[PDB]
Amino acid sequence: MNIVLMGLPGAGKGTQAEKIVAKYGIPHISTGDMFRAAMKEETPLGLEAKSYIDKGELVPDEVTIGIVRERLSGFLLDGFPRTVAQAEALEEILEEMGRKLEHVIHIDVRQEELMERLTGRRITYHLVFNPPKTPYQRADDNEETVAKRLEVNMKQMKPLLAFYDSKEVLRNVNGEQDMEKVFKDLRELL
Ligand SMILES: Nc1ncnc2c1ncn2[C@@H]1O[C@H](COP(=O)(O)OP(=O)(O)OP(=O)(O)OP(=O)(O)OP(=O)(O)OC[C@H]2O[C@@H](n3cnc4c(N)ncnc43)[C@H](O)[C@@H]2O)[C@@H](O)[C@H]1O
């Protein structure tokens, strides 16, 4: 059970991740969560990562690969690879491990829906979609920062999708649905 979740900021990676972990019971290696853990603990990694994360940019491939390579030593990779260079590195790591990627799952959502999804997010919950009975909000979910995140991720998305689409491991799922309907489709694949 070796799975990769990729998707644009706010597509529903982490949302589906929790459901995948609860259903199947596997490790969940989320670069985003790892950086947030590292940032909060003020480790050297966290410090140098913070500048890029707060800017909305991607942290360099070297350090991102470093952190993942060690941490892999079934699984659910979340937000990795999100560049080709990262994916190129993963292929070697996995061959070095003796475990191949069974499925790469792209959660497809539309750049318009993402702005609303990220701004309305409360941590997950959402103000209009998954509302709490009664009423924190992420630092990088600011309108201005979200725009930078979408810009930067879309650019790296195409080369990846094409990469994995050629490999014949890519599987698109319709992300623009109810949470459980999105998960059902994942179930079908998994
Ligand atoms: N490999 C890498 N290389 C370089 N840098 C890296 C890296 N990996 C991480 N980073 C760094 O990490 C930073 C942040 O990355 P990261 O923390 O991974 O965030 P992201 O990739 O930008 O995506 P988000 O986490 O914002 O959205 P999500 O996909 O988790 O969706 P969510 O479940 O919240 O759900 C979205 C919202 O919508 C709602 N929602 C969920 N599902 C549905 C549905 N089906 N219908 C309607 N609404 C829904 C939810 O309630 C929720 O509020 C990056 O800026 C970068 O700095």
Short mmCIF file of C-alpha atoms and ligand atoms in Angstrom, two decimals:
data_model
loop_
_atom_site.label_atom_id
_atom_site.label_comp_id
_atom_site.label_asym_id
_atom_site.label_seq_id
_atom_site.Cartn_x
_atom_site.Cartn_y
_atom_site.Cartn_z
CA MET A 1 0.00 0.00 0.00
CA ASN A 2 2.35 2.71 -1.32
CA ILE A 3 0.48 5.87 -2.14
CA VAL A 4 1.34 9.41 -3.18
CA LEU A 5 -1.13 12.30 -2.79
CA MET A 6 -0.47 15.31 -4.95
CA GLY A 7 -2.74 18.30 -5.56
CA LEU A 8 -2.88 22.08 -5.72
CA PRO A 9 -3.00 24.01 -2.37
CA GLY A 10 -6.45 23.37 -0.88
CA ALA A 11 -7.43 20.48 -3.16
CA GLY A 12 -8.10 18.30 -0.10
CA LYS A 13 -4.85 16.34 0.43
CA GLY A 14 -4.78 16.48 4.24
CA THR A 15 -8.53 16.03 4.42
CA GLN A 16 -8.40 12.77 2.49
CA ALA A 17 -5.17 11.79 4.23
CA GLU A 18 -6.84 11.56 7.64
CA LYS A 19 -9.55 9.40 6.17
CA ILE A 20 -6.98 7.14 4.48
CA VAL A 21 -5.08 6.77 7.77
CA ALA A 22 -8.27 5.95 9.73
CA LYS A 23 -9.56 3.46 7.16
CA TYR A 24 -6.37 1.52 6.35
CA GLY A 25 -4.03 2.37 9.22
CA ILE A 26 -0.70 3.30 7.64
CA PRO A 27 2.07 5.88 8.13
CA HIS A 28 1.39 9.38 6.80
CA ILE A 29 4.50 11.30 5.74
CA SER A 30 3.36 14.87 5.06
CA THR A 31 6.18 17.30 4.22
CA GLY A 32 3.92 20.21 5.17
CA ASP A 33 3.25 18.77 8.63
CA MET A 34 6.93 17.92 9.03
CA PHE A 35 7.93 21.51 8.27
CA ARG A 36 5.28 22.83 10.67
CA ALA A 37 6.55 20.47 13.39
CA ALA A 38 10.12 21.58 12.65
CA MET A 39 9.16 25.27 12.61
CA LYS A 40 7.35 25.03 15.96
CA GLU A 41 10.36 23.31 17.53
CA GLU A 42 12.78 25.93 16.09
CA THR A 43 15.25 23.42 14.65
CA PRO A 44 17.81 24.54 11.99
CA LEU A 45 15.60 22.85 9.36
CA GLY A 46 12.56 24.75 10.63
CA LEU A 47 14.36 28.11 10.53
CA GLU A 48 15.59 27.88 6.93
CA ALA A 49 12.29 26.36 5.82
CA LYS A 50 10.22 29.12 7.45
CA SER A 51 11.46 31.92 5.20
CA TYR A 52 10.28 30.02 2.07
CA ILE A 53 6.99 28.80 3.62
CA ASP A 54 5.85 32.22 4.87
CA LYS A 55 6.76 33.73 1.45
CA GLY A 56 4.49 31.11 -0.19
CA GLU A 57 7.42 29.60 -2.09
CA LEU A 58 8.58 26.00 -2.16
CA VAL A 59 11.47 24.98 0.07
CA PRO A 60 14.52 23.79 -1.93
CA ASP A 61 14.44 20.24 -3.32
CA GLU A 62 17.68 19.30 -1.55
CA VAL A 63 16.45 19.79 2.01
CA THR A 64 12.97 18.45 1.15
CA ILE A 65 14.51 15.29 -0.30
CA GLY A 66 16.90 15.01 2.66
CA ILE A 67 14.12 15.12 5.21
CA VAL A 68 12.02 12.55 3.27
CA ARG A 69 14.88 10.21 2.42
CA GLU A 70 15.79 9.80 6.06
CA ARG A 71 12.16 9.55 7.21
CA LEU A 72 11.38 6.62 4.87
CA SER A 73 14.17 4.61 6.52
CA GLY A 74 2.95 0.68 3.40
CA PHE A 75 3.03 4.46 3.35
CA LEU A 76 1.20 7.62 2.38
CA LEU A 77 3.33 10.41 0.92
CA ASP A 78 1.46 13.69 1.18
CA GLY A 79 2.64 16.80 -0.68
CA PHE A 80 5.64 14.89 -2.02
CA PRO A 81 6.80 14.81 -4.70
CA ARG A 82 5.52 18.20 -5.76
CA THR A 83 8.37 18.72 -8.27
CA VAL A 84 9.98 16.47 -10.90
CA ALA A 85 13.38 16.67 -9.21
CA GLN A 86 11.77 15.31 -6.03
CA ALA A 87 10.06 12.57 -7.96
CA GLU A 88 13.33 11.67 -9.71
CA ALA A 89 14.91 11.26 -6.24
CA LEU A 90 12.00 9.20 -4.91
CA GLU A 91 12.35 6.60 -7.70
CA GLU A 92 15.89 5.86 -6.50
CA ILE A 93 15.00 5.89 -2.81
CA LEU A 94 12.21 3.38 -3.47
CA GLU A 95 14.42 1.10 -5.59
CA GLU A 96 16.97 1.38 -2.75
CA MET A 97 14.11 0.32 -0.44
CA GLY A 98 12.69 -2.42 -2.69
CA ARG A 99 9.20 -0.97 -2.74
CA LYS A 100 7.56 0.62 -5.79
CA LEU A 101 4.83 3.26 -5.98
CA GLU A 102 1.54 1.40 -6.41
CA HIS A 103 -0.51 4.52 -7.16
CA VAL A 104 -0.02 8.26 -7.55
CA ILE A 105 -3.34 9.99 -6.85
CA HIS A 106 -3.97 13.53 -8.13
CA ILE A 107 -6.88 15.28 -6.44
CA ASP A 108 -8.15 17.55 -9.17
CA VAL A 109 -9.69 20.86 -8.16
CA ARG A 110 -9.91 24.12 -9.99
CA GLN A 111 -7.79 27.13 -9.33
CA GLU A 112 -10.91 29.22 -8.66
CA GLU A 113 -12.26 26.98 -5.88
CA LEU A 114 -8.93 26.95 -4.08
CA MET A 115 -8.85 30.61 -2.99
CA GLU A 116 -12.20 30.18 -1.23
CA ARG A 117 -11.20 26.81 0.20
CA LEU A 118 -8.02 28.07 1.80
CA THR A 119 -9.31 31.43 3.13
CA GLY A 120 -12.43 29.87 4.72
CA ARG A 121 -10.42 27.02 6.34
CA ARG A 122 -10.34 26.76 10.13
CA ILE A 123 -8.17 24.12 11.87
CA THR A 124 -9.70 20.82 9.61
CA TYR A 125 -13.01 22.62 9.15
CA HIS A 126 -14.51 25.12 6.68
CA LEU A 127 -16.79 28.09 7.30
CA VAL A 128 -19.29 27.32 4.50
CA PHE A 129 -18.63 23.67 3.53
CA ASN A 130 -17.87 21.68 6.68
CA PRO A 131 -19.18 24.12 9.26
CA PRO A 132 -18.71 23.67 13.01
CA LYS A 133 -21.79 23.94 15.23
CA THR A 134 -20.13 26.93 16.88
CA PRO A 135 -17.17 29.07 15.69
CA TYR A 136 -7.40 28.86 14.51
CA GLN A 137 -6.72 30.16 10.98
CA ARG A 138 -3.46 29.19 9.19
CA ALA A 139 -0.74 31.80 8.70
CA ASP A 140 -0.12 31.00 5.01
CA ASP A 141 -3.86 31.01 4.10
CA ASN A 142 -3.78 34.78 3.53
CA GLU A 143 -5.20 35.96 0.23
CA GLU A 144 -1.84 37.37 -0.91
CA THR A 145 0.14 34.30 0.12
CA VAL A 146 -2.39 31.82 -1.31
CA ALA A 147 -2.01 33.47 -4.72
CA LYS A 148 1.75 32.92 -4.56
CA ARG A 149 1.24 29.28 -3.54
CA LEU A 150 -1.08 28.58 -6.47
CA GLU A 151 1.28 30.28 -8.90
CA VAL A 152 4.29 28.28 -7.70
CA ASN A 153 2.52 24.88 -7.44
CA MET A 154 0.72 25.03 -10.84
CA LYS A 155 4.11 25.60 -12.50
CA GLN A 156 5.56 22.45 -10.95
CA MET A 157 2.32 20.48 -11.37
CA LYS A 158 2.42 19.96 -15.15
CA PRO A 159 5.93 18.48 -15.40
CA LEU A 160 4.99 16.06 -12.58
CA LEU A 161 1.60 14.96 -13.91
CA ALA A 162 3.22 14.34 -17.30
CA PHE A 163 6.07 12.46 -15.57
CA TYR A 164 3.70 10.11 -13.70
CA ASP A 165 1.18 9.98 -16.56
CA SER A 166 3.95 8.57 -18.76
CA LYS A 167 4.83 6.09 -16.01
CA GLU A 168 1.15 4.86 -16.09
CA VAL A 169 0.82 5.13 -12.28
CA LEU A 170 -1.12 8.40 -12.27
CA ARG A 171 -4.78 8.32 -11.32
CA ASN A 172 -6.97 11.45 -11.44
CA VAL A 173 -9.86 11.78 -8.99
CA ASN A 174 -12.66 14.37 -9.13
CA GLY A 175 -11.95 16.59 -6.10
CA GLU A 176 -14.90 18.92 -6.69
CA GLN A 177 -17.40 16.81 -4.75
CA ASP A 178 -18.58 16.16 -1.18
CA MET A 179 -15.79 14.96 1.10
CA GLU A 180 -17.12 11.42 1.35
CA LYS A 181 -17.76 11.10 -2.40
CA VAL A 182 -14.15 12.06 -3.03
CA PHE A 183 -13.07 9.40 -0.53
CA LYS A 184 -15.31 6.75 -2.14
CA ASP A 185 -13.47 7.27 -5.43
CA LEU A 186 -10.16 6.82 -3.59
CA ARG A 187 -11.56 3.63 -2.09
CA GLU A 188 -12.38 2.38 -5.61
CA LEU A 189 -8.74 2.90 -6.63
CA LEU A 190 -7.18 1.67 -3.41
N1 LIG B 1 7.44 18.72 -1.40
C1 LIG B 1 7.58 19.99 -1.03
N2 LIG B 1 8.46 20.79 -1.61
C2 LIG B 1 8.59 22.05 -1.26
N3 LIG B 1 7.87 22.62 -0.33
C3 LIG B 1 6.95 21.95 0.32
C4 LIG B 1 6.76 20.56 0.00
N4 LIG B 1 5.80 20.10 0.75
C5 LIG B 1 5.43 21.14 1.52
N5 LIG B 1 6.11 22.24 1.26
C6 LIG B 1 5.93 23.51 1.96
O1 LIG B 1 4.75 23.46 2.74
C7 LIG B 1 3.96 24.60 2.54
C8 LIG B 1 2.52 24.26 2.76
O2 LIG B 1 2.28 23.00 2.19
P1 LIG B 1 1.09 22.13 2.74
O3 LIG B 1 0.99 22.27 4.21
O4 LIG B 1 1.21 20.75 2.18
O5 LIG B 1 -0.15 22.89 2.15
P2 LIG B 1 -0.50 22.87 0.61
O6 LIG B 1 0.18 21.77 -0.15
O7 LIG B 1 -0.31 24.27 0.13
O8 LIG B 1 -2.04 22.47 0.66
P3 LIG B 1 -2.92 22.74 1.95
O9 LIG B 1 -2.38 21.94 3.07
O10 LIG B 1 -3.05 24.21 2.09
O11 LIG B 1 -4.32 22.23 1.43
P4 LIG B 1 -4.74 20.71 1.58
O12 LIG B 1 -4.46 20.05 0.30
O13 LIG B 1 -4.09 20.12 2.79
O14 LIG B 1 -6.32 20.71 1.69
P5 LIG B 1 -7.09 20.59 3.07
O15 LIG B 1 -7.26 19.17 3.51
O16 LIG B 1 -6.59 21.66 3.99
O17 LIG B 1 -8.58 20.96 2.71
C9 LIG B 1 -8.87 22.22 2.14
C10 LIG B 1 -10.11 22.88 2.69
O18 LIG B 1 -11.24 22.56 1.89
C11 LIG B 1 -12.21 21.81 2.59
N6 LIG B 1 -12.54 20.62 1.79
C12 LIG B 1 -11.90 19.45 1.82
N7 LIG B 1 -12.44 18.56 0.99
C13 LIG B 1 -13.47 19.15 0.40
C14 LIG B 1 -14.48 18.76 -0.59
N8 LIG B 1 -14.50 17.54 -1.13
N9 LIG B 1 -15.39 19.67 -0.94
C15 LIG B 1 -15.38 20.89 -0.41
N10 LIG B 1 -14.49 21.30 0.50
C16 LIG B 1 -13.53 20.50 0.93
C17 LIG B 1 -11.53 21.41 3.88
O19 LIG B 1 -12.43 21.50 4.95
C18 LIG B 1 -10.42 22.40 4.06
O20 LIG B 1 -10.88 23.54 4.76
C19 LIG B 1 4.25 24.99 1.13
O21 LIG B 1 4.11 26.38 0.99
C20 LIG B 1 5.70 24.67 1.05
O22 LIG B 1 6.30 25.73 1.72
#
